Amino acid sequence: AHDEETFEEFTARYEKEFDEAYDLFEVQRVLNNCFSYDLVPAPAVIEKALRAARRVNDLPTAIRVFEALKYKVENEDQYKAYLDELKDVRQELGVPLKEELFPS
Amino acid sequence: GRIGESWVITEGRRLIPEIFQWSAVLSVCLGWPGAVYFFSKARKA
Amino acid sequence: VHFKDGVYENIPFKVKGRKTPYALSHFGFFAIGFAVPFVACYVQLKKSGAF
Amino acid sequence: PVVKTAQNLAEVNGPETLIGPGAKEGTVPTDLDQETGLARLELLGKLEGIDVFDTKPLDSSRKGTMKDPIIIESYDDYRYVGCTGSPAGSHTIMWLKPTVNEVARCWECGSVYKLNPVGVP
Amino acid sequence: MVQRWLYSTNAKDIAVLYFMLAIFSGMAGTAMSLIIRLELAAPGSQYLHGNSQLFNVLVVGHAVLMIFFLVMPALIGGFGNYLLPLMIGATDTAFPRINNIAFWVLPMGLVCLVTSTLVESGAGTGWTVYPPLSSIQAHSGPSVDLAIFALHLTSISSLLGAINFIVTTLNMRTNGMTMHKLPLFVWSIFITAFLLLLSLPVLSAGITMLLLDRNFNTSFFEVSGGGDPILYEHLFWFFGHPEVYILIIPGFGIISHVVSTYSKKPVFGEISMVYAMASIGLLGFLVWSHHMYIVGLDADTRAYFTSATMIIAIPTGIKIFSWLATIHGGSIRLATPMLYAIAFLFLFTMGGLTGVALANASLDVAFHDTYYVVGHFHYVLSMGAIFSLFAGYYYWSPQILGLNYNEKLAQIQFWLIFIGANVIFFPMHFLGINGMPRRIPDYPDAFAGWNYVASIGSFIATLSLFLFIYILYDQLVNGLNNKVNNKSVIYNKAPDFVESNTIFNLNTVKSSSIEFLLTSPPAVHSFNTPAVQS
Amino acid sequence: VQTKALSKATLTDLPERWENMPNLEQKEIADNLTERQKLPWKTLNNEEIKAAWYISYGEWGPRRPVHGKGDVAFITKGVFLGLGISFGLFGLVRLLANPETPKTMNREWQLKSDEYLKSKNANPWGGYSQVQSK
Numbered sequence: 001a002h003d004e005e006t007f008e009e010f011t012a013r014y015e016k017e018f019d020e021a022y023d024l025f026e027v028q029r030v031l032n033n034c035f036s037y038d039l040v041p042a043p044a045v046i047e048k049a050l051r052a053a054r055r056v057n058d059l060p061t062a063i064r065v066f067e068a069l070k071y072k073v074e075n076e077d078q079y080k081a082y083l084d085e086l087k088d089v090r091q092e093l094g095v096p097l098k099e100e101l102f103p104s
Numbered sequence: 105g106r107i108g109e110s111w112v113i114t115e116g117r118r119l120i121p122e123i124f125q126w127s128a129v130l131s132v133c134l135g136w137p138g139a140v141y142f143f144s145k146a147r148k149a
Numbered sequence: 150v151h152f153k154d155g156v157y158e159n160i161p162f163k164v165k166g167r168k169t170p171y172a173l174s175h176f177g178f179f180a181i182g183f184a185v186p187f188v189a190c191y192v193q194l195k196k197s198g199a200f
Numbered sequence: 201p202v203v204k205t206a207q208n209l210a211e212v213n214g215p216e217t218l219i220g221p222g223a224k225e226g227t228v229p230t231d232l233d234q235e236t237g238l239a240r241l242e243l244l245g246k247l248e249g250i251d252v253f254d255t256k257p258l259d260s261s262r263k264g265t266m267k268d269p270i271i272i273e274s275y276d277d278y279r280y281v282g283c284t285g286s287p288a289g290s291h292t293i294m295w296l297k298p299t300v301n302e303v304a305r306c307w308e309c310g311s312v313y314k315l316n317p318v319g320v321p
Numbered sequence: 322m323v324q325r326w327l328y329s330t331n332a333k334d335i336a337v338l339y340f341m342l343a344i345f346s347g348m349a350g351t352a353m354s355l356i357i358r359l360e361l362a363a364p365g366s367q368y369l370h371g372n373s374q375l376f377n378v379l380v381v382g383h384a385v386l387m388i389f390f391l392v393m394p395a396l397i398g399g400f401g402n403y404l405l406p407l408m409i410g411a412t413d414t415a416f417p418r419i420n421n422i423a424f425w426v427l428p429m430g431l432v433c434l435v436t437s438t439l440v441e442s443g444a445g446t447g448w449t450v451y452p453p454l455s456s457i458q459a460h461s462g463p464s465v466d467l468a469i470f471a472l473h474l475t476s477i478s479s480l481l482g483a484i485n486f487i488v489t490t491l492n493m494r495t496n497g498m499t500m501h502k503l504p505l506f507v508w509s510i511f512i513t514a515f516l517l518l519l520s521l522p523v524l525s526a527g528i529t530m531l532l533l534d535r536n537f538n539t540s541f542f543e544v545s546g547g548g549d550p551i552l553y554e555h556l557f558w559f560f561g562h563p564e565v566y567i568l569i570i571p572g573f574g575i576i577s578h579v580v581s582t583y584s585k586k587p588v589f590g591e592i593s594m595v596y597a598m599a600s601i602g603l604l605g606f607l608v609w610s611h612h613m614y615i616v617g618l619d620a621d622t623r624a625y626f627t628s629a630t631m632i633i634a635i636p637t638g639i640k641i642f643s644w645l646a647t648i649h650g651g652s653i654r655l656a657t658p659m660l661y662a663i664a665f666l667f668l669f670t671m672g673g674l675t676g677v678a679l680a681n682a683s684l685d686v687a688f689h690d691t692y693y694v695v696g697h698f699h700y701v702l703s704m705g706a707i708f709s710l711f712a713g714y715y716y717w718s719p720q721i722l723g724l725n726y727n728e729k730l731a732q733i734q735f736w737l738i739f740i741g742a743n744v745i746f747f748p749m750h751f752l753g754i755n756g757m758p759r760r761i762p763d764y765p766d767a768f769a770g771w772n773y774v775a776s777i778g779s780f781i782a783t784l785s786l787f788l789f790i791y792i793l794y795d796q797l798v799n800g801l802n803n804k805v806n807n808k809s810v811i812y813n814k815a816p817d818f819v820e821s822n823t824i825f826n827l828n829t830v831k832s833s834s835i836e837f838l839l840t841s842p843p844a845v846h847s848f849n850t851p852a853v854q855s
Numbered sequence: 856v857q858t859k860a861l862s863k864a865t866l867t868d869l870p871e872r873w874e875n876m877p878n879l880e881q882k883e884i885a886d887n888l889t890e891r892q893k894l895p896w897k898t899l900n901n902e903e904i905k906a907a908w909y910i911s912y913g914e915w916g917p918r919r920p921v922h923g924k925g926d927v928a929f930i931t932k933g934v935f936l937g938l939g940i941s942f943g944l945f946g947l948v949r950l951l952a953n954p955e956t957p958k959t960m961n962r963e964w965q966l967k968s969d970e971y972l973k974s975k976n977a978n979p980w981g982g983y984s985q986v987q988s989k
């Protein structure tokens with residue numbers, strides 16, 4: 001569809017596309033196709049992406065979500081007010097970030 | 105955006121150092137005839 | 150007959166199994182290519198003046 | 201030895217069966233009489249109903265992933281397949297190389313392609 | 322091996338031979354450019370003492386050899402013969418003996434052009450070989466007859482290749498290639514092969530009229546006797562502008578593909594880009610006399626042609642804007658063909674802007690047969706077609722030859738040819754607007770500095786080609802060791818961000834045309850079965 | 856609880872160890888890490904999370920950079936060396952050209968040749984002085 005996609009149609013289409021993946025190629029593929037759009041996705045998309053990366057049982061694609069997002073955002077105040085919205089999902093899912101994992 | 109440092113400042117900080125290096129690379133991609141004229145004997149060297 | 154394919158059976162030069170080094174043929178090709186205008190200049194400079 | 205000339209597409213047995221009978225002394229030859237080889241094969245096929253050298257854009261109706269792939273057919277061990285989405289023109293054309301021992305996954309559409317390699321080498 | 326290289330009706334083993342004559346003739350032509358710019362380095366009779374006829378012979382040899390035996394083979398013949406069957410899924414081309422005779426009548430045009438520069442001092446006219454400078458009264462000998470028989474043979478070669486290309490991409494496409502789904506280099510070779518058979522018949526007619534009023538006593542351009550030399554200027558430049566649009570349109574195709582595949586983005590509006598390229602093709606015939614603003618045309622027809630050459634200028638502009646749009650927002654992996662693709666945009670936009678400075682029929686009276694013109698075409702022809710040629714070789718030859726080159730030597734070769742060719746042709750503009758005419762052996766010694774600067778640059782531009790020759794040698798004897806021992810780049814398309822390495826090794830090549838899915842050096846029967854597409 | 860954790864010595868210092876490890880050990884710790892990820896994620900120790908991130912996403916193999924480890928210095932050294940080499944070879948090619956100059960090249964001729972110009976006021980507002988010789 002070459003007609004534009006509003007934000008609600010975007011987040012509903014991609015939530016129903018993150019729910020259906022079963023392999024690892026599918027999760028990374030739909031994650032790349034979600035991040036290589038123009039907008040940054042709302043955390044309703046990305047907590048579902050974290051659950052869909054938990055279903056395949058591999059860790060580093062549940063970390064590169066956070067680093068790709070840090071490359072996505074326009075400053076770090078948006079990044080901090082973002083990351084305190086995905087706090088408890090990051091807690092009980094137990095994934096790390098980059099800056100505390102690789103201190104440099 | 106809505107909350108954060110404003111887009112005018114956070115893109116001026118990205119692009120204002122780029123203008124001077126663009127001017128440098130254009131002044132040395134088109135201005136080397138001035139540098140070769142400066143040392144020759146036509147400028148009473 | 151389909152001619153058999155490899156990494157060195159796509160070019161007219163034989164490279165691996167030779168008797169002479171490959172640098173001889175590969176640089177003599179561009180030596181004669183770079184020296185055909187010089188021999189044109191020589192045959193044109195002995196026909197009119199000197200050299 | 202004994203050779204007949206393959207009245208339709210069922211009785212071909214190689215390149216020695218596509219000859220056919222010659223014309224007479226006065227009649228102009230028809231293409232059924234004298235044409236031989238691959239052209240005779242295509243003519244006999246088109247007179248039977250089928251046409252050989254099956255040219256068709258591949259089925260991009262369903263998506264299809266590793267539970268049931270998109271099955272393609274080739275007489276060799278590989279077949280270059282240019283995927284263009286779950287509709288006919290969704291994303292730009294990405295070329296995959298499904299072979300006999302590996303499926304081909306699109307990475308932009310997501311569909312997979314697997315062969316039934318006919319072969320007979 | 323005699324039946325694989327001398328008879329050889331297979332479009333993969335004809336393109337290698339095309340490329341071999343291309344590198345041979347390009348070496349000969351740049352030896353002539355080195356000799357020209359070495360003699361023009363200082364006023365007073367240098368290395369060739371006196372003898373302006375030898376300099377005229379050298380400049381027509383450089384011009385016609387490097388146009389019709391390097392750029393046209395290594396863009397039309399070699400690259401089209403290797404890639405036009407390999408992108409649309411034909412097993413190989415239609416009329417295979419026709420593009421074998423096209424290649425095999427190239428180097429006999431080359432050997433008669435070489436032996437034309439030896440007999441009775443020689444053809445000196447420049448590549449736009451004009452009457453009555455070339456008629457038998459003012460130029461006696463069998464030299465320019467062999468020099469234009471070379472053009473007859475090259476003309477025949479390029480037309481046979483054009484008919485070959487046109488039918489082999491109008492009929493033998495693969496299963497799903499529609500009329501507008503082809504990659505853009507196929508469309509460039511398509512439109513270029515149309516402009517060849519729509520243009521060069523007029524050229525061959527005009528130059529055989531030149532031959533049979535040289536030797537067969539007719540009077541087409543012999544003026545005392547009825548004719549006029551203005552008719553040759555018309556009949557020549559009616560080919561002479563479509564010839565360079567032929568030489569530059571596959572450059573646009575190559576640059577489109579390499580900026581599409583080194584920025585991980587499709588080209589911005591491929592349909593509008595191919596409409597712009599096709600309109601450039603069908604419009605490049607209507608502006609043939611912008612090389613004849615001086616000879617005595619009316620101001621009304623000069624007004625028409627200076628109106629129409631700017632509408633020639635606009636779709637090249639929208640093509641360059643689409644190139645900026647398709648490299649914008651990408652993930653640009655700066656390898657060595659992407660460097661040439663980036664340099665081509667700037668170094669061709671510069672020449673096109675000075676070209677539309679030339680295109681005003683008002684302004685052409687101050688700039689005609691003047692080194693400003695040399696600065697324009699030695700931008701848009703040299704840097705254009707040959708930076709696209711280098712971005713064709715450094716991008717395709719790991720797939721064709723199957724041997725990976727050295728990377729750091731490729732980047733020093735790019736920066737050496739970029740610096741050492743930007744220092745040559747940039748003082749030509751100052752020599753032009755200060756008043757230096759073309760084709761002089763040398764000059765009144767006022768403007769004695771910019772020629773010296775250009776001559777100190779041409780040695781850099783020659784040393785970079787010597788390093789390119791060493792790149793060819795290091796690729797040919799150290800291909801597998803540059804695969805293994807970490808001197809090269811192996812994947813031209815990098816893995817995306819959130820994709821693992823174990824997942825990149827599944828889908829190795831994310832192409833959009835067929836050519837990077839065939840194995841290194843590809844099989845002689847690649848498409849046994851057709852290559853389906855939806 | 857079935858699979859065992861990798862010990863410290865098999866997995867220490869892995870971004871500094873991945874390039875010279877044999878290709879039979881790399882498949883083993885790749886298998887071991889991709890089965891260790893099937894547990895709850897909080898019981899994955901902090902020594903092996905860096906190992907998994909470098910194995911799946913590190914700058915090795917496919918993600919190797921095109922300008923790696925000071926090769927920008929090598930290519931600018933090659934560019935300036937090529938400029939110097941071409942300058943020297945242009946000089947010693949220039950050395951063998953022709954012994955004598957045209958006689959109107961030294962400054963003594965140029966002063967007369969622009970005195971003649973200012974006699975007839977040619978190029979009055981722009982430049983008219985011609986010397987260009989030492």
Ligand code: HEA
Pocket residue numbers: 343344346347348351353354355357358380381383384385387388391392395446447448449695699702703704707710711714742758759760761779782783786
């Ligand atoms: C193909 C077009 C082409 C190219 C590339 C060049 C490039 C050069 N030319 Fe020019 N030239 C002409 C076509 C070209 N020229 C024409 C048509 C005229 C007009 C003649 C007339 O009207 O009388 C002219 C005139 C002309 C003049 C003006 C003289 C005059 O008329 O008064 C000069 C002076 O410097 C010159 C010398 C050079 C030099 C030193 C180069 C250097 O740039 C050469 C260095 C080039 C390279 C190093 C390119 C790489 C070479 C390869 C072989 C790469 C191989 C790669 C593959 C095969 C993929 N030629």
Ligand code: HEA
Pocket residue numbers: 449564565566568569611612613614630633634635637638639641669670672673674676677678679680681685688689690694697698701702
């Ligand atoms: C490769 C072939 C080729 C190409 C592509 C061009 C490109 C152009 N050339 Fe050139 N030209 C030659 C080959 C070529 N030329 C040759 C061989 C000679 C010497 C002949 C001789 O011996 O006498 C010559 C010299 C020459 C002349 C003859 C002058 C004379 O001899 O007296 C003219 C006249 O109009 C001209 C004009 C142009 C224009 C307007 C373009 C345009 O096509 C350029 C288009 C590009 C741009 C316009 C820039 C990109 C666009 C934008 C950035 C958008 C904004 C731009 C605008 C709004 C203008 N050039």
Ligand SMILES: [Cu+2]
Pocket residue numbers: 561562563611612
């Ligand atoms: Cu033109």
Ligand SMILES: [Mg+2]
Pocket residue numbers: 689690
């Ligand atoms: Mg003219």
Ligand SMILES: [Zn+2]
Pocket residue numbers: 283284285286291294306308309310311
């Ligand atoms: Zn797809």
